[PDB]
């Protein structure tokens, strides 16, 4: 479902942005 793909969407997502200042 979209929720299945919305998890790690964010997930996935968040791990670059936060890279971005690592």
Avoid: C, F, Y
Avoid at 1 to 22: A, G, H, P
């Amino acid at each position: 479902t979209d929720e299945d793909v919305k998890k790690w969407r964010e997930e996935r997502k968040k791990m670059w942005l936060l890279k971005i200042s690592n």
